[PDB]
């Protein structure tokens, strides 16, 4: 079973004038289905099982 | 609305982080993953049409 | 150190790293898992 359920983030420095708009452009891409596009084309392949 | 109107300083609960809310309230790191899922009553289940 | 302005990689959000850098909201929710090495053995009709 999965443990230490911490996700993947974009790292920026403490100042990071882009910190707020990067996160807002990541929540937006989850809702738009853009990340489901990326999961389909890069993660969900299922060669054999 | 309570945090936006400064009636409270926190909104601990089952709030999901999203676009519109993050532009009026400052969320923290998620403590549990959620999303949108579909719950369907089970269809019992059958044998394959080519068993 | 200033070499990079962003880390676009599978960087896990941690308490240790969060004290020095600003992580974004996760673009991928996941966890830790263990990977291990993976028909019919009917010898004959007898
Ligand atoms: C559904 C039930 C209803 C029907 C029932 C019918 C009644 C049956 C009637 C009679 C049977 C009488 C006894 C003889 C049977 C062999 C026994 C034996 O010791 O063989 C050995 C050598 O056998 C082989 O390894 C070869 C068998 C397959 C190839 C065919 C060669 C001829 C064998 C037959 C010649 C024809 C004889 C004709 C005259 C009788 C077994 O080798 P093993 O390595 O120990 O095998 C273990 C099994 N294992 C590999 C899966 C682990
Ligand atoms: N938990 C959701 C509401 C429930 C839902 O509609 O899925 C929220 O904070 O807005």
From Swiss-Prot, chain B:
Disease: Intellectual developmental disorder, autosomal dominant 6, with or without seizures: A disorder characterized by significantly below average general intellectual functioning associated with impairments in adaptive behavior and manifested during the developmental period. MRD6 additional features may include seizures, hypotonia, abnormal movements, such as dystonia, and autistic features. Developmental and epileptic encephalopathy 27: A form of epileptic encephalopathy, a heterogeneous group of severe early-onset epilepsies characterized by refractory seizures, neurodevelopmental impairment, and poor prognosis. Development is normal prior to seizure onset, after which cognitive and motor delays become apparent.
Function comment: Component of N-methyl-D-aspartate (NMDA) receptors (NMDARs) that function as heterotetrameric, ligand-gated cation channels with high calcium permeability and voltage-dependent block by Mg(2+). Participates in synaptic plasticity for learning and memory formation by contributing to the long-term depression (LTD) of hippocampus membrane currents. Channel activation requires binding of the neurotransmitter L-glutamate to the GluN2 subunit, glycine or D-serine binding to the GluN1 subunit, plus membrane depolarization to eliminate channel inhibition by Mg(2+).
Effect of residue 42 to H: In DEE27; decreased protein abundance; decreased localization to the cell membrane; increased glutamate-gated calcium ion channel activity via an allosteric effect which is characterized by increased glutamate and glycine potency and increased open probability; the mutant channel is less sensitive to magnesium inhibition and has increased calcium permeability compared to wild-type
Sites carrying sugar chains: 44
UniProt binding sites for L-glutamate: 16, 21
Gene that specifies this protein: GRIN2B
Range covered out of full length: 499 to 549 of 1484
Domain of life: Eukaryota
Domain comment in the entry: The extracellular N-terminal domain (NTD) endows NMDARs with a unique capacity for allosteric modulation, harboring several binding sites for small molecule ligands that act as subunit-specific allosteric modulators of ion channel activity.
Phylogenetic classification of the source organism: Eukaryota, Metazoa, Chordata, Craniata, Vertebrata
PTM info: Phosphorylated on tyrosine residues.
Tissue expr: Primarily found in the fronto-parieto-temporal cortex and hippocampus pyramidal cells, lower expression in the basal ganglia.
Compartments, as annotated in UniProt: Cell membrane; Postsynaptic cell membrane; Cell projection, Dendrite; Late endosome
Record's protein name: Glutamate receptor ionotropic, NMDA 2B
Entry similarity comment: Belongs to the glutamate-gated ion channel (TC 1.A.10.1) family. NR2B/GRIN2B subfamily.
UniProtKB/Swiss-Prot annotation, chain C:
Residues that bind glycine: 10, 12, 17
Subcellular localization: Cell membrane; Postsynaptic cell membrane; Postsynaptic density membrane; Synaptic cell membrane
Whole sequence portion shown: 507 to 555 of 938
Function: Component of N-methyl-D-aspartate (NMDA) receptors (NMDARs) that function as heterotetrameric, ligand-gated cation channels with high calcium permeability and voltage-dependent block by Mg(2+). NMDARs participate in synaptic plasticity for learning and memory formation by contributing to the long-term potentiation (LTP). Channel activation requires binding of the neurotransmitter L-glutamate to the GluN2 subunit, glycine or D-serine binding to the GluN1 subunit, plus membrane depolarization to eliminate channel inhibition by Mg(2+).
Disorder named in the UniProt entry: Neurodevelopmental disorder with or without hyperkinetic movements and seizures, autosomal dominant: An autosomal dominant neurodevelopmental disorder characterized by severe intellectual disability and developmental delay, absent speech, muscular hypotonia, dyskinesia, and hyperkinetic movements. Cortical blindness, cerebral atrophy, and seizures are present in some patients. Neurodevelopmental disorder with or without hyperkinetic movements and seizures, autosomal recessive: An autosomal recessive neurodevelopmental disorder characterized by severe intellectual disability and psychomotor developmental delay, involuntary and stereotypic movements, spasticity, and inability to walk without support. Intractable seizures manifest in some patients.
Organism: Homo sapiens
Superkingdom of origin: Eukaryota
Oligomeric form and interacting partners: Heterotetramer; the NMDAR subunits are modular and harbor tiered domains that function in concert to regulate opening and closing of the cation-selective ion channel pore. Forms heterotetrameric channels composed of two GluN1/zeta subunits (GRIN1), and two identical GluN2/epsilon subunits (GRIN2A, GRIN2B, GRIN2C or GRIN2D) or GluN3 subunits (GRIN3A or GRIN3B) (in vitro). Can also form heterotetrameric channels that contain at least two GluN1 subunits and at least two different GluN2 subunits (or a combination of one GluN2 and one GluN3 subunits) (in vitro).
PTM comment, free text: NMDA is probably regulated by C-terminal phosphorylation of an isoform of GRIN1 by PKC. Its phosphorylated state is influenced by the formation of the NMDAR-PPP2CB complex and the NMDAR channel activity.
The name this protein goes by in its record: Glutamate receptor ionotropic, NMDA 1
Similarity remark: Belongs to the glutamate-gated ion channel (TC 1.A.10.1) family. NR1/GRIN1 subfamily.
């Amino acid at each position: 079973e999965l443990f230490f359920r911490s996700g993947f983030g974009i790292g920026m420095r403490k100042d990071s004038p882009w910190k707020q708009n990067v996160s807002l452009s990541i929540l937006k891409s989850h809702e738009n289905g853009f990340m489901e596009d990326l999961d389909k084309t890069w993660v969900r392949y299922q060669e054999c099982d | 609305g309570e945090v936006v109107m400064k009636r409270a300083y926190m909104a601990v609960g089952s709030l999901t982080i999203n676009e519109e809310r993050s532009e009026v309230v400052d969320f923290s790191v998620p403590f549990i993953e959620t999303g949108i899922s579909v719950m369907v009553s089970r269809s019992n289940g059958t044998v394959s049409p080519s068993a | 150190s200033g070499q990079a302005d962003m880390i676009v990689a599978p960087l896990t959000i941690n308490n240790e790293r969060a004290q020095y850098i600003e992580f974004s909201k996760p673009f991928k929710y996941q966890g830790l898992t263990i990977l291990v090495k993976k028909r019919s053995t009917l010898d004959s009709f007898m």
